């Protein structure tokens, strides 16, 4: 049982769940994806507490159980300041390892660019430094889909008929192929998905679904800045990840000494497709960089 509480950061109440000890060797801040999902689907990383890794989960502004600020603050830059503020008034000056998943990865990168001096290492899983490049790669994945689903996406997607039954069918197919290659999805993942739909962050910042980024972050691209990251960096990406290894690669080319690990038979949520392998890899990376 981890410690759960509300923390008032930039004027709002942000929910966080801290799982630590025994014999804590390091702390790990985690940034769920979306934008607009929740920490819930990242819960499998809890397996690293028995490896001496203290894991910190938290719902970003307007996500899960956290309240949302003024819509004018629905940006990655604010997410960065929120993140630092949380780290500060929870761990103080202590340096920590930051892990970001998907959008969380993007956020982690934006964070590192400005506050890498507060970190000992950075982990990006299915992350990205450029939304446009991510869009491009996803369109390719959509083209590789069977004509039926590929046509329903362009057909109903161009008219904004995201509620269409044929479209939703194409979405599920794509997800079972690039989001989670499993038939029996865990409650944690499903809860993050439900949170995305029920709140307003995903809709505004991201868009309708995973591969339809019509949100306010559609032009975001810090590929040029991420080259300043001078800390141990681990980059993981699923073989069939919706955020392709091509996107992962671009981040790998930018961060010197960074490592890239492409999980076989895995897609986006590699923490559930290969839970042990994923946690083992992160555990080893963290433990060899104290
Ligand atoms: N929707 C994914 C990845 C993504 C983010 C932002 C734009 C496009 C794609 C994430 O953030 C959820 Cl796990």
UniProtKB/Swiss-Prot annotation:
Cross-referenced InterPro entries: AB_hydrolase_1, AB_hydrolase_fold, AB_hydrolase_sf, Peptidase_S33, Pro_imino_pep
Family: Belongs to the peptidase S33 family.
Keywords: Aminopeptidase, Hydrolase, Protease
Subunit structure: Part of the tricorn proteolytic complex.
The species this protein was found in: Thermoplasma acidophilum (strain ATCC 25905 / DSM 1728 / JCM 9062 / NBRC 15155 / AMRC-C165)
EC number: 3.4.11.5
Name by which UniProt lists this protein: Proline iminopeptidase
Enzyme class per UniProt: hydrolase
Active site (UniProt): 102, 241, 268
GO MF terms held by the record: aminopeptidase activity
A GO BP annotation: proteolysis
Reaction(s) catalysed by this chain's protein: Release of N-terminal proline from a peptide
One GO cellular component, as annotated: membrane
Family annotation (Pfam families): Abhydrolase_1
Record function comment: Cleaves H-Pro-AMC as well as a wide spectrum of amino acid substrates and several peptide substrates without a proline at the N-terminus. Proteases F1, F2 and F3 degrade oligopeptides produced by Tricorn (themselves probably produced by the proteasome) yielding free amino acids.
NCBIfam families recorded: pro_imino_pep_2 (TIGR01250), ProImpepThrmp (NF045948)
């Amino acid at each position: 049982e981890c410690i759960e509480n509300y923390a008032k950061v930039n004027g709002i109440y942000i929910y966080y769940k801290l799982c630590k000890a025994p014999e804590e060797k390091a702390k790990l801040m985690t940034m769920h994806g979306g934008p607009g999902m929740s920490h819930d689907y990242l819960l499998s990383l809890r397996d690293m507490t028995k490896e001496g890794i203290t894991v910190l989960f938290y719902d970003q502004f307007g996500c899960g159980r956290s309240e949302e600020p003024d819509q004018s603050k629905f940006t990655i830059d604010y997410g960065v300041e929120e993140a630092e503020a949380l780290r500060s008034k929870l761990f103080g000056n202590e340096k920590v390892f930051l892990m970001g998943s998907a959008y969380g990865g993007a956020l982690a990168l934006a964070y590192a660019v400005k506050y890498q001096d507060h970190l000992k290492g950075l982990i990006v899983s299915g992350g990205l430094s450029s939304v446009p490049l991510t869009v491009k790669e996803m369109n390719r994945l959509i083209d590789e889909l069977p004509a039926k689903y590929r046509d329903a996406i362009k057909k109903y997607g161009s008219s904004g008929s995201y509620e269409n039954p044929e479209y939703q069918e194409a979405v599920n197919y794509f997800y079972h192929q690039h989001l989670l290659r499993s038939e029996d999805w865990p409650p944690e993942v499903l809860k993050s998905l439900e949170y995305a739909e029920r709140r307003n962050v995903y809709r505004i910042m991201n868009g309708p679904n995973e591969f339809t980024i019509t949100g306010t972050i559609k032009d975001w691209d810090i590929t040029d800045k991420i080259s300043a990251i001078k800390i141990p960096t681990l980059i993981t990406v699923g073989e069939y990840d919706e955020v392709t290894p091509n996107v992962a690669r671009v981040i790998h080319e930018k961060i010197a000494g960074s490592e890239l690990h492409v999980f076989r038979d895995c897609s986006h949520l590699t923490m559930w497709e290969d839970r042990e392998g994923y946690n083992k890899l992160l555990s080893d990376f963290i433990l060899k960089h104290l």
